[PDB]
Design a protein around this nucleic acid. Sequence first.
RNA 1: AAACUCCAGUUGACACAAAAUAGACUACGAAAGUGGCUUUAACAUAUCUGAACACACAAUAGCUAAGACCCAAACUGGGAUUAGAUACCCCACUAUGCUUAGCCCUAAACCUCAACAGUUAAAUCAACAAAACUGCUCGCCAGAACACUACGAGCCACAGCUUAAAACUCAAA
Lengths: 128, 97, 86, 74, 23, 72, 137, 122, 48
Amino acid sequence: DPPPSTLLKDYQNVPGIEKVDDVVKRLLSLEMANKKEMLKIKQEQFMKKIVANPEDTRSLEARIIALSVKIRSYEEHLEKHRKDKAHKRYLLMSIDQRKKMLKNLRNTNYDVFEKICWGLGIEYTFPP
Amino acid sequence: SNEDLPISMENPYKEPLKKCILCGKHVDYKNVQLLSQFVSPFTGCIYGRHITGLCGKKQKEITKAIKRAQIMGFMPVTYKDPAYLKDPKVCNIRYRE
Amino acid sequence: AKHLKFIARTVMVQEGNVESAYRTLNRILTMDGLIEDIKHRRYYEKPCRRRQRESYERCRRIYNMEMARKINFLMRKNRADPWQGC
Amino acid sequence: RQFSYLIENMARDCGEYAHTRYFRGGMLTNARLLFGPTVRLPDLIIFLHTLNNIFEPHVAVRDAAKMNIPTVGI
Amino acid sequence: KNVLKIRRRKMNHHKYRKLVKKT
Amino acid sequence: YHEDRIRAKFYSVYGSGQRAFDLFNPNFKSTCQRFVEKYTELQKLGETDEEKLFVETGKALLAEGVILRRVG
Amino acid sequence: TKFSIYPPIPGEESSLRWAGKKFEEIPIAHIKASHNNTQIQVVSASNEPLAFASCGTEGFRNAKKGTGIAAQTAGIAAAARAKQKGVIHIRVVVKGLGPGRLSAMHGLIMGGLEVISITDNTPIPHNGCRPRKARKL
Amino acid sequence: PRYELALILKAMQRPETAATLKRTIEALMDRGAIVRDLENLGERALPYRISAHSQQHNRGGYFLVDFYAPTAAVESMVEHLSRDIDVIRGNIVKHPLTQELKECEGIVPVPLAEKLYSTKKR
Amino acid sequence: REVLQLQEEVKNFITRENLEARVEAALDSRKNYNWAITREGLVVRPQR
RNA sequence: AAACUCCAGUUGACACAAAAUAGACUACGAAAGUGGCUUUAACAUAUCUGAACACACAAUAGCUAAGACCCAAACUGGGAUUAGAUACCCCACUAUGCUUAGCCCUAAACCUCAACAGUUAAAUCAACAAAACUGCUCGCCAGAACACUACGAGCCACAGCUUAAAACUCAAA
Ligand SMILES: CN[C@@H]1[C@H](O[C@H]2[C@H](O[C@H]3[C@H](O)[C@@H](O)[C@H](NC(=N)N)[C@@H](O)[C@@H]3NC(=N)N)O[C@@H](C)[C@]2(O)C=O)O[C@@H](CO)[C@H](O)[C@H]1O
Ligand code: FES
Ligand SMILES: [K+]
Ligand SMILES: [Mg+2]
Ligand SMILES: [Mg+2]
Ligand SMILES: [Mg+2]
Ligand SMILES: [Mg+2]
Ligand SMILES: [Mg+2]
Ligand SMILES: [Mg+2]
Ligand SMILES: [Mg+2]
Ligand SMILES: [Mg+2]
Ligand SMILES: [Mg+2]
Ligand SMILES: [Mg+2]
Ligand SMILES: [Mg+2]
Ligand SMILES: [Mg+2]
Ligand SMILES: [Mg+2]
Ligand SMILES: [Mg+2]
Ligand SMILES: [Mg+2]
Ligand SMILES: [Mg+2]
């Protein structure tokens, strides 16, 4: 879980933000943002770790990473909201959509399939 | 060929689309003087878009702002504050006659 | 209960003409809808019945507006026949 | 109705016939009874106004096609 | 449309539910 | 037509003037049409911008005595 | 000045006086026009009961109380008990859409009382409690 | 995020009102807030009678506190305003200036619905 | 540009050191968010 | 008529209930469904299709357990009507509707009009309704009734739900 002091994806690139006030760096951090700003950084970390070209986000490899961050988001929402049937369906459908991506990626490029399963910790399983 | 033939062009005589009185303005829940202009002075009921003349997007901003100002301790509910009774009438509704 | 009294739904009497004040007050309550609301709140109107009445009232308006819009559009043609005899 | 007078006069001027009045159903498709067995129908019908007063096609347009009469129309 | 086919099923179900309460 | 853009701007700035149309007269020239003729004639000279061309057309009509009261 | 139909707010100073008394001081006539009865109670500015009358207290029974003549009779009976205590001008606060909603207002005028305002305080909830089920009669 | 604390204080004197605001602004800083401004809307009459802490109030002071704080600080501060005896009513809403207003081009006329019924001679 | 604008504003932000002084200043001034509108779309600021 | 008469009216204090106007809007969501305020989390998928039974949901009613209780209210009791009145009308009150935790798994769950893509030409098209078609796929259906049954299986369901025949019978529906 990226620390709360981590800067936002957008702001970090801007030059001259290294030497500014501590309060201006705290307003641009993850502490004063919502949960969707921390998920944009988690997706950024995986792409550098896994995909050769992070810039391309329309690839199958990128889509798996973008959808796996939502799965963790839903599991954190369902650990506190157990009776939320709406987000329990968005999770189970997302796990089925990722299984279809791992099948198509395992049939085309088995090299990246092993890389993604190792990076994300996905134990691929064949259907019954 | 001929040079008198008409040309493919968008209507130049077209008039600019009409706008509501509150187009381009921010509707805040603290401005009870503006939110009281769209409520009945006797019952406190919110007027519709056939009276106010507002658009769908601004009509729901007044409604959402009135309900929020009412429950926060900024605006009455059963009546219109008498202080804002001598303000410009913008709603199309005549009671007395 | 918690609001100020004698502001809401209050009309002052001019030269002891109570009749005009009561008619004005009743016109304020009918235009706002309070009169009809109080009549439907005496007996509980089930959701399904309340949705059937809103649709009936909305389709009646649509029809009445168009019929009126045509009557005002064709009232110009209610003049005397200019070609009497042909 | 505005041009009913004008058309009737021209028809008289050009030695031809006119009908600017209400078309009684059967003038053409029932002429034998209305006029007689030895009646001669028109060989050419000129429609200066193809619509009636309720903005619908004149009945004679279809009644002239049933009787195989050629029609001219504005 | 009529409900002449629902009235046939209406009594069938009523007679069946009334027989289960008796037995 | 190409002169409809010029007409739309002439009416907006000045609107229909006192002079009334005479549709019966086939060869009737309206005040706006006269403006367009001058405007088109000045385009042949070589001016490539509407704002200057439009402003220059108005002055010519004023020199000829035409009345062009703005909506102002 | 002109004449407005809106009541004079207490705080802001006005010039409208009735027998040397401000609008706030004028007594109030609380009318509860129900469907089967009509109760009338006159009170002062300090909520002090001066007179009470109703169709039942005037000798009406059952379905005669839900008429316009019984409400008018009840107004005369309350406008005759309050006129002995020094009441002339009143503020009418009608509550209910019953038959004796306007007939009681006439009866108060037939007792020597002058109505200066007409207030409606008919209970309207913003959905609260559920009414009884509709009837087939 | 950036919030707005619509605070309605009890009608008191200047020494007591300033002690309450400071006590309230220090509670935000303790929860991780970055207060930005403190606007005063003035003391007026309430629209309706408010009953709080076994007291029926008819007047109050309106103060706005614009600030930045984490999402978890809003729920903890709402429990601090419910225990303060000098705070009639206090609500936290997202600042309206962090919500860009989409540009409007005007009212689009809507043409009557067509082809709703078959063109057959009923 | 946003960072630069924010950097200027943060200076005015209330701090523990200047907390008491700012409170007193707030109690002397008043902010009015009330403004009506006409049928033409013009804002009618209150004369106060 | 019964009922009530610590009853009624004004004022004041006071909710684990329900959410006027806006809404002449037509939005969200897979559907069910959702219309008081605020905040947090948050609304799958860069081809489509794809299940009575897998997986997960599903109005009202209902069961079990513990709380709450303004009002409404099956049952029940009383009053009246009536040839009778186990009903319609009046009164009172309960289960229930609410919360928490489990279950049940149904609907005229019907916009009775499957999902995706596309067209408006030709023979427009039995009728009515919400104009008529094409491609592709899944699901279903073949006289009526017996039958939202019987048996069997499965199910926290034990007067239940799902799935679901035949014989006898008619010449119509
Ligand atoms: C054209 N024939 C019509 C038809 O007649 C039928 C009619 O057939 C009846 C059967 O006998 C009886 O067992 C059968 N009874 C049963 N319990 N199933 C009747 O339902 C049946 N009638 C019918 N389906 N409409 O009675 C028979 C004697 C009949 O005349 C045979 O042809 O049905 C009659 C009406 O029942 C009509 O009056 C006739 O016009
Ligand atoms: S018309 Fe642009 S906001 Fe109402
Ligand atoms: K349906
Ligand atoms: Mg049967
Ligand atoms: Mg509500
Ligand atoms: Mg599918
Ligand atoms: Mg199958
Ligand atoms: Mg099923
Ligand atoms: Mg269910
Ligand atoms: Mg239940
Ligand atoms: Mg009860
Ligand atoms: Mg009985
Ligand atoms: Mg109960
Ligand atoms: Mg439904
Ligand atoms: Mg399908
Ligand atoms: Mg069969
Ligand atoms: Mg069933
Ligand atoms: Mg069965
Ligand atoms: Mg069985």
